[PDB]
Design a binder for this molecule. Structure first.
Ligand SMILES: Nc1ncnc2c1ncn2[C@@H]1O[C@H](COP(=O)(O)OP(=O)(O)O)[C@@H](O)[C@H]1O
Ligand SMILES: Nc1ncnc2c1ncn2[C@@H]1O[C@H](COP(=O)(O)OP(=O)(O)O)[C@@H](O)[C@H]1O
Ligand SMILES: [Mg+2]
Lengths: 525, 49, 426, 527
């Protein structure tokens, strides 16, 4: 080789050699990740070097937390990273298309043909697959019963179907009360808190917010009803000047006068708070809660506790965005224009301690537009199962609201798309006739893996499914309980349109680029 | 078969049973398996091809 | 009050940070699984400064360990007393930095630093009065320059008024690890003179000749390297962790170390330096340890204090001694060697002492102070930065992650302005 | 000559291992959790044995409670950590029954290997266990025979707390039941939230367990620095600031410009501190407790006006003292205290076991806080009784949340083994085999009680089903002597933690299901 002459410590791979490196590594990631596609998949226990258990079967967490050092596996992991970043689900099915787009193409390239001829057939097959996907999508005007079946499909494939009935009520009802009137739903308004209280099948949907820090004073009230939220960003603790100044005093009687005077600017901020409580008709209970993102010294905590004001400290950055919408106040950065217009309202503000760790709850709001899924998993690894499934389910219902159409389920899309490429296979009129055949057989791995994980036959299932599609017009699919071809649009199994659109685009470009690689080498030392 | 007869023997060792009791039950079961095969047997004509 | 949260970010920060808590847990007598083994208020009063007391008597160190590597921080997981921290103070990173400054900011830093700021928020809940933060990192490391520069900028959005005491491991002028070390050293310091106030300079490869000549070590390693660095780290945080007559916390150290806020590069060090066999055959007096820190044999960086001039001198002693002999001994050097000191400062050498002895040594002093010794080291970094950027060598490793050619131009103009900033009073 | 087998399809690990299949992953997770079930089987029950466990810090832990054993054993198997963390959740929820999780889930996975190797796979064992687990939570309200409702006093809760004590302290079951009765009932919140943090244990090295007692107050391990150790009025002023004066926070610097400001500065500092100590002597205070340090001038006027000083370096101990005497910790220096004073009955000092202690003893108004002063011959014995005391405090929190009880000692698990077997015989499906194996997992729990008592468990488990003929539902185990002839449990008084039995079945079933879901294991290189 030429690279061995210039650098003697530089490995290389030739034309017929680098193709066998990328294809055999794509089969290595395919044979591992095909055991978790669908509800009948198996759980994978992932142990790191420390010893912690990461029990999950999502395709993005499997590829990142896997001890593999391969250049081909690093290319598929980057495409799988963007699939779980912008649209959630569609990561396990992403790798299985690339694992079949390189295996079905190896049957032609090794039999005399050139790899560029196969890539010309992939673009002509992608044009028909994109037009066929727009004909099978179903617009259902974003009904709240439709979004249940969309969230149920994404949640079953990550849990054992006892928590899928609980998490669907916590995902669909959370995504509806955020934004209205054709507004893009921000996913930062949903807080995900990890608790340990009861059990995994006890995750509820808090209509307000759940803060992970409690009151930092023992004399404060633990349960406050009909409260006023005062969201602050000022620093109530003692701060000095920016210029280094210090103090200078002569006698000991002037020493105590400087300690009283150095807290005057601090107590002026506290006197603006306790006078706001007297201007909101404080002849009742009239609870007051200050979340107060910046820290508070215990001198001001003792002053606010005597008036009956609960004061938290050290809040998050987005806690001044979620609580501002939930309480309806104004997140102030100063106390120069304090007014009752910037105050919030909550019917119940209470705390609870779980092993010397308080959790502040804010509930009973009118129109919060900001909720919190309270995950109460028993173990530490069970919290990672629900959190990775909630964000897989929240991004599934967010795409079904933004896009106006719903795409059908398991085999109602991939089988019908492969049959459309057979009748349009002589439409290319050239050497790329076998490229459309390699793309149509690669899309059939989704009914093949789902029939394999459920325990049924692989080839006997695909004959009966393609027979019911060719002898009818209904988009029939795979049933993971009986094996008979069942329609996915009637049983309540749906999918996202942007997932299937990017599965035809991200997997096709990354397959046409890998097949055109013939000089895998390592230089730079 | 020896791996399975020891598989069921491990269950009784957890039940605070002495190994001489299980072996004395194995020898009584061994003498009855030989007598059962001789009752279900069939004579063969060795001259038949 | 005056709580300080410690942030050990980087590969070299966790190796120093592993032995940083070994000195504090031994001097204070804090049991890792019990409650305490102190004797009086010299050790039991300042527990709440660096530790948060849990319910039952167990003490937890206010420490955050950040690393973009699972295998590096696993030694601090279940190794030399690493099971004492919080479980959420072990933020791992599955994507390595690769000794690249642009990769740790735009690729790794865009997804991790929102979670690292959550650990500082949970540590600040148990702080009734947050004094500041410390940051131990390195310039020649990927995580030390990636998760050390981006972490120090996002912490000012939440803490704009609090002081900062950064610890920076400078690269060595003797040996080199990779050719992107002038790139990582120029970019990390260029955002460090912007809005910080304290930064030390420790050279690890320069200490291999100190252990070979003075500490009598034939084959040194990383374990013998960080032992005397931890003695220098404990010398600065001595009056912060032990009460005494010369009360000077980090707030009093931020003012009386720098007359100007930009020229905040110091030269740490300590004294004496004894081996494992020749330690008991040596007496330690007050003018013996006070006159050893000014020479070149007690420097933590590869610099020469015999051709420079100091600005502010602070020294912390260990042991009950007469501190009036320290000021009278150092005032006689300021009259005969006035070209090395300041001409208008009547008391250049400050005094600090405690009543807690160190580990191993009987008496010990530390040297904290800035001079023009960082000026000659900043010229060699900009000299290597000039020859590499003029050929534009390995710029696609940086510009492919989100950098540009104008990014290195502004990083070269202000770093050469810092050379002229130290060139005025030299 | 000799060839070898290389990698085949996906061997890309740099020193890591990979497990897949029923034999390499599922059956090896069963055999690893089977060894933890046989480990704590000896320490289960009133006749259980202790275990001297040495952790990485070379210190001794001797106990018979399975919760603190797993915290010191450095287990590295991943599926074995799932049964350790499930037993840790039993300690955080109810505080008792952590050994029940290791026996029940250890028998669930052991009988799961007898089902995967005989027939159906994990798709029906998991669905077969969850059917019998939901039916197991329906028999538990039907097995409640007594309730901890009538006469909530120190006489009735002494017998209700004997079961949690005798399982770890068999010989000291009577004296520890009286010490846990005079402490838990005295801190009652008058039908409110019961706090387990308001009971502290002061380990005093000395004589045996017969000298242990419960004092209404708090007992510390510090000194006075004064001569006012005899206080009978006990008006306590609590401060969190250091009792040494008032210094500023920014820099602090005295500036002298003339000779009148230098000479009068020393006398002006003494008159400033004298007016602050005498300000609390005019209010009637006797005990001044601070959190920080105390200067020499503060000790000069504390002994002059005859007020006692208490140094509390811990800040969590300072908050417990405010709930003891009913005071408020003042962050500022000494004010004229209006109404935030403390009020105790007797504050004194005494050297007990060569340890000078400070006792805030409440004579008449006894119920604000309780402290159990334990006396032991060794420091390791006082840790084992403190584990037995804290299990008695957590049992009192269970009876506050749910007053129902079930007959323990083996009487509950046999009735659970009989009703689940009735559901298994009436199940017209292939999942009935896992339901009958779920009832046999309850059979091994009184089997561990008979093996620790030196009795043959085959004759013990045969008499339990013979006396459970559809109407008794109460006969457990009589482990006081050999040749059992087992009797009733309501007559002997062995019944405890129905809510403890409710969470222990739910957590151990979810622990065994989580192991069976693991079909493929990918571990990393350990460091
Ligand atoms: N209830 C169901 N019935 C049939 N097929 C399903 C069902 N739920 C999910 N699937 C199929 O499983 C496939 C993978 O789902 P999922 O694992 O959530 O996404 P990914 O595999 O991309 O991570 C989908 O293509 C879908 O068709
Ligand atoms: N007096 C008694 N007679 C018979 N059995 C008893 C007696 N006291 C306790 N036991 C048994 O000892 C067992 C102790 O269980 P234990 O280890 O305390 O469970 P956990 O670890 O969940 O607290 C109980 O299951 C109970 O049946
Ligand atoms: Mg017990």
């Amino acid at each position: 080789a030429a690279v061995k002459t210039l650098n003697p410590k530089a490995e290389v791979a030739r034309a017929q050699a680098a193709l066998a490196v990328n294809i055999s590594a794509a089969r290595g990631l395919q044979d591992v990740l095909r055991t978790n596609l669908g509800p009948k998949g198996t759980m994978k226990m992932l142990v790191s070097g420390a010893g912690d258990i990461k029990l999950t079967k999502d395709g993005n967490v499997l590829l990142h937390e896997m001890q593999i050092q391969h250049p081909t596996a690093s290319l598929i992991a980057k495409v799988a990273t963007a699939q779980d970043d912008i649209t959630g689900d569609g990561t396990t099915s992403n790798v299985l298309i690339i694992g079949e787009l390189l295996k079905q193409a190896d049957l032609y390239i090794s039999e005399g043909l050139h790899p560029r001829i196969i890539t010309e057939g992939f673009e002509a097959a992608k044009e028909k697959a994109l037009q066929f996907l727009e004909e099978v999508k179903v617009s259902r005007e974003m009904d709240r019963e439709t979004l249940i079946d969309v969230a149920r499909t994404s949640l079953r494939t990550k849990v054992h179907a006892e928590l899928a009935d609980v998490l669907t009520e916590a995902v669909v009802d959370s995504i509806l009360a955020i934004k209205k009137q054709d507004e893009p739903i921000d996913l930062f308004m949903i807080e995900i808190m990890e608790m340990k209280h009861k059990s995994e099948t006890d995750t509820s949907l808090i209509r307000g917010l759940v803060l992970d820090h409690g009151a930092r004073h023992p004399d404060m009230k633990k349960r406050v009803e009909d409260a006023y939220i005062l969201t602050c960003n000022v620093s109530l603790e003692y701060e000095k000047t920016e210029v280094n100044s210090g103090f200078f005093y002569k006698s000991a009687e002037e020493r105590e006068k400087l300690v009283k005077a150095e807290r005057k600017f601090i107590e002026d901020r506290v006197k603006k708070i306790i006078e706001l409580k007297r201007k909101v008709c404080g002849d009742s209970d009239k609870g007051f809660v200050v979340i107060n993102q910046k820290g508070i010294d215990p001198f001001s905590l003792d002053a606010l506790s005597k008036e009956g004001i609960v004061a938290l400290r050290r809040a998050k950055r987005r806690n001044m965005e979620r609580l501002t919408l939930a309480c309806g106040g104004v997140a102030l950065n100063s106390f120069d224009d304090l007014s009752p217009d910037c105050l919030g309202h909550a019917g119940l503000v209470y705390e609870y301690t779980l092993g010397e760790e308080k959790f502040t709850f804010i509930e009973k709001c009118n129109n919060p537009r900001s909720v919190t899924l309270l995950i109460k998993g028993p173990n530490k690894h069970t919290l990672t199962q629900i959190k990775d499934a909630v964000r897989d389910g929240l991004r599934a219902v967010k795409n079904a609201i933004d896009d106006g159409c719903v795409v059908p389920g398991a085999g109602a899309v991939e089988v019908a798309m492969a049959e459309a490429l057979i009748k349009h296979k002589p439409s290319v009129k050239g050497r790329a006739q076998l490229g459309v055949q390699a793309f149509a057989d690669a899309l059939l791995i989704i009914p093949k893996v789902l029939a394999q994980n459920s325990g049924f036959d692989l080839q006997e299932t695909l004959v009966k499914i393609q027979a019911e599609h060719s002898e009818s017009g209904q988009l029939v699919g795979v049933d993971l309980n009986t094996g008979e071809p069942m329609v996915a649009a009637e049983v309540g199994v749906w999918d996202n349109y942007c997932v299937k659109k990017q599965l035809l685009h991200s997997c096709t470009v990354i397959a046409t680029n890998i097949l055109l690689v013939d000089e895998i080498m390592r230089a730079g030392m | 078969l020896a791996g399975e007869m020891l598989s069921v023997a491990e269950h009784f060792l957890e039940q605070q049973m002495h190994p001489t009791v299980v072996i004395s039950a194995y020898r009584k079961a061994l003498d009855d398996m030989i007598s059962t095969l001789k009752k279900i047997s069939i004579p063969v004509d060795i001259s038949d091809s | 009050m005056r709580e300080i949260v410690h942030i050990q970010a980087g590969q070299c920060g966790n190796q120093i940070g592993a032995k940083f808590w070994e000195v504090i847990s031994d001097e204070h007598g804090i049991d890792p699984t019990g409650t305490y083994h102190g004797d009086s208020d010299l050790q039991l009063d300042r527990i709440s400064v660096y530790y948060n007391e849990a319910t039952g008597g167990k003490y937890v160190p206010r420490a955050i360990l950040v690393d973009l590597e699972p295998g590096t921080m696993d030694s601090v997981r279940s190794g030399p007393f690493g099971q004492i921290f919080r479980p959420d103070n072990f933020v791992f990173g599955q994507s390595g930095a690769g000794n690249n400054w642009a990769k740790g900011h735009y690729t790794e830093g865009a997804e991790l630093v929102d979670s690292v700021l959550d650990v500082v928020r949970k540590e600040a809940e148990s702080c009734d009065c947050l004094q500041g933060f410390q940051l131990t990192h390195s310039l020649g490391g990927g995580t030390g320059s990636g998760m050390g520069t981006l972490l120090i900028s996002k912490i000012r959005e939440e803490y704009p008024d609090r002081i900062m005491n950064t610890f920076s491991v400078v690269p060595s002028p003797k040996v080199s690890d990779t050719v992107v070390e002038p790139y990582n050293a120029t970019l990390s310091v260029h955002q460090l003179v912007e809005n910080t106030d304290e930064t030390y300079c420790i050279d690890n490869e320069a200490l291999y000749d100190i252990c070979f000549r003075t500490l009598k070590l034939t084959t040194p390693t990383y374990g013998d390297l960080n032992h005397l660095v931890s003695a220098t780290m404990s010398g600065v945080t001595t009056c912060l962790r032990f009460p005494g007559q010369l009360n000077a916390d980090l707030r009093k150290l931020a003012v009386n170390m720098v007359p100007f806020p930009r020229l905040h590069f110091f030269m740490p060090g300590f004294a004496p330096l004894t081996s494992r066999g020749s330690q008991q055959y040596r007496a330690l007096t007050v003018p013996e340890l006070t006159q050893q820190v000014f020479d070149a044999k007690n420097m933590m960086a590869a610099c020469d204090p015999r051709h420079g001039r100091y600005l502010t001198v602070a020294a912390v002693f260990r042991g009950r001694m007469s501190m009036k002999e320290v000021d009278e001994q150092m005032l006689n050097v300021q009259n005969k060697n006035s070209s090395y000191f300041v001409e208008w400062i009547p008391n250049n050498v400050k005094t600090a002492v405690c009543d807690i002895p160190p580990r191993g040594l009987k008496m010990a002093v530390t040297f904290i102070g800035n001079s023009t010794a960082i000026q000659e080291l900043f010229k060699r970094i900009s000299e290597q930065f000039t020859a590499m950027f003029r050929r534009k060598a390995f710029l696609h490793w940086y510009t492919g992650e989100g950098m540009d050619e104008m990014e290195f131009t502004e990083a070269e103009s202000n770093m050469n302005d810092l050379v002229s900033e130290y060139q005025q009073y030299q | 000559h000799v060839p070898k087998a290389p990698g085949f399809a996906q061997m890309l690990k740099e020193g890591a291992k990979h497990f897949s299949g029923l034999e390499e992953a599922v059956y090896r997770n069963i055999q690893a959790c089977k060894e933890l079930a046989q480990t704590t089987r000896t320490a289960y029950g009133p006749n259980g044995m202790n275990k001297m466990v040495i952790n990485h810090l070379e210190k001794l832990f001797v106990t018979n409670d399975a919760a603190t054993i797993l915290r010191e054993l450095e287990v590295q198997h991943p599926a074995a950590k799932m049964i350790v963390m499930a037993s840790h959740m039993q300690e955080q929820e109810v505080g008792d029954g952590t050994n029940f999780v290791l026996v029940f889930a250890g028998a669930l996975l052991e009988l799961a290997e007898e089902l995967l190797r005989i027939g159906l796979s994990v798709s029906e064992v998991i669905e077969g266990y969850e059917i019998a687990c939901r039916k197991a939570h329906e028999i538990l309200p039907n097995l409640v025979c007594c309730s901890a409702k009538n006469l909530r006093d120190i006489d009735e809760v002494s017998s209700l707390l004997r079961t949690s004590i005798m399982s770890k302290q068999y010989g000291n079951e009577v004296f520890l039941a009286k010490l846990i009765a005079q402490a838990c009932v005295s801190i009652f919140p008058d039908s409110g939230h019961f706090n387990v943090d308001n009971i502290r244990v002061c380990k005093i090295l000395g004589s045996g367990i017969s000298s242990s007692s419960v004092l209404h107050g708090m007992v510390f391990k510090k000194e006075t620095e004064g001569d006012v150790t005899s206080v009978k009025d006990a008006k306590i002023a609590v401060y969190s600031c250091p009792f040494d004066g008032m210094i500023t926070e920014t820099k602090g610097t005295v500036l002298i410009k003339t000779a009148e400001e230098l000479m009068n500065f020393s006398k002006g500092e003494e008159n400033l501190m004298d007016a602050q100590v005498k300000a609390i002597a005019d209010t009637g205070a006797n005990v001044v407790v601070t959190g920080g340090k105390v200067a020499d001038m503060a000790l000069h006027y504390a002994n002059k006006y005859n007020i006692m000083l208490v140094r509390l370096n811990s800040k969590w101990d300072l908050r417990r003292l405010c709930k003891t005497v009913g005071a408020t910790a003042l962050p500022r220096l000494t004010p004229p205290v209006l109404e935030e004073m403390g009020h105790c009955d007797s504050v004194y000092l005494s050297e007990v076991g060569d340890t000078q202690v400070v006792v805030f003893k409440h004579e008449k108004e006894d119920g604000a806080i309780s402290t159990i002063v334990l006396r032991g011959s060794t420091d390791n014995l006082m840790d084992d009784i403190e584990r037995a005391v804290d299990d008695g405090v957590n049992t009192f929190k269970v009876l506050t949340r749910d007053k129902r009880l079930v007959p323990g000692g083996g009487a509950t698990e046999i009735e659970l083994a009989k009703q689940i077997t009735s559901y298994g015989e009436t199940c017209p499906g292939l999942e009935q085999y896992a339901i009958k194996k779920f009832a046999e997992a309850f059979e091994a729990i009184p089997r561990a009680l008979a093996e620790n008592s030196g009795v043959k468990a085959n004759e013990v488990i045969s008499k339990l089903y013979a006396v459970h003929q559809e109407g008794n539902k109460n006969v457990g185990l009589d482990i006081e002597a050999e040749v059992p002839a087992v009797k009733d449990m309501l007559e002997a008084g062995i019944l405890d933690t129905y809510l403890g039995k409710y969470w222990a079945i739910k957590l151990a079933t979810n622990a065994a299901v989580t192991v069976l879901r693991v079909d493929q294991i990918i571990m990393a290189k350990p460091a």
